[PDB]
Structure formats: structure tokens, C-alpha cells
């Protein structure tokens, strides 16, 4: 199919490219189909809705900015994403771009079972992670 996008103009996509979010994303419970679009030659990846051109979240791989970031997925999350055995899992965090005052949501990363093409925004428990971590400490 052919879709319009927030940052990429009109593009062709294939069913193979679509990541299904069976629960949508919080605040967007009805948005169950996304594609991942690199920007390009930047580290940013857009989580672009296949049904709503204006909905595109700005993602980064978190170790770009937070080298000590560490995540543990619980069983119920593995079951909801049907993650078993040798299947591969991709990990991202959503950026709120303010480039100076930007924050990343480390509490609630985007987790994708690439092989089953399923995703979810996972809410981490019993961590010190917050929904806004500054990319740049205020000291610089």
C-alpha cells in the first residue's frame, strides 16, 4: 500500500513492514499498525502510523544517550508479545523534542517482537526510571 507520513512524504509500504500493536499505544488505543522509518543518516527512527499520517513518534535506541540503561521484561510481557525461544526483540524509547530541552521516556520503552511483528509500550515496574529523562544534563 501507499501511505502519507509525518516526516517522509508519500511512501510505499508492504504488509511485511507493518508492526502490529494489539493494545495500540496509550493515548492511541485504536492505532494498531505502525511502520519504522529511519530519517536517514540520523539516529532517529519514526514510529509512523499506517492509518494516520500525522501520527509519528520520534524514537531512539536508548544506548545512544543512556549507556547504563537496563531493562528486564516480565513473563506477562513476554506472553503478551508472544516472545519465546530464539525470536528477536527490538528496544526503543520515545523522545519528546522541546534540541536543547528534550527528554526521553525511559520508564515506558517501545518493545517489538520483530519476528511475530508485535509491539507494545511496556511500563517498567519497580525502577527509578521516569517518563522524562533529559538527554543533556542541565549542567552543560
Swiss-Prot record:
Family named by the database record: Belongs to the FliW family.
Protein name (Swiss-Prot/TrEMBL): Flagellar assembly factor FliW
One Pfam family of this chain: FliW
Source organism of the structure: Geobacillus thermodenitrificans (strain NG80-2)
GO cellular component, one term: cytoplasm
SUPFAM superfamilies in alphabetical order: BH3618-like (SSF141457)
Chaperone listed as a keyword: yes
Domain of life: Bacteria
Keyword match Cytoplasm: yes
Keyword terms of this UniProt record: Bacterial flagellum biogenesis, Chaperone, Cytoplasm, Translation regulation
Amino acid at each position: 500500500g501507499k501511505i502519507a507520513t509525518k516526516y517522509h512524504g508519500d511512501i510505499e509500504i508492504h504488509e511485511k513492514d507493518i508492526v502490529r500493536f494489539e493494545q495500540g499505544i496509550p493515548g492511541f488505543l485504536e492505532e494498531k499498525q505502525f511502520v519504522l522509518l529511519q530519517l536517514e543518516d540520523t539516529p532517529f527512527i519514526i514510529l509512523q502510523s499506517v492509518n494516520t499520517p500525522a501520527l509519528g513518534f520520534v524514537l531512539i535506541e536508548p544506548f545512544s544517550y543512556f549507556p547504563t540503561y537496563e531493562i528486564d521484561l516480565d513473563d506477562n510481557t513476554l506472553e503478551q508479545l508472544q516472545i519465546t525461544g530464539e525470536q528477536d526483540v527490538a528496544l526503543y524509547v520515545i523522545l519528546t523534542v522541546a534540541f536543547d530541552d528534550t527528554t526521553a521516556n525511559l520508564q515506558a520503552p517501545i518493545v517489538i517482537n520483530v519476528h511475530k511483528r508485535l509491539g507494545k509500550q511496556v511500563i517498567l515496574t519497580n525502577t527509578n526510571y521516569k517518563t522524562k529523562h533529559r538527554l543533556f544534563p542541565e549542567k552543560v
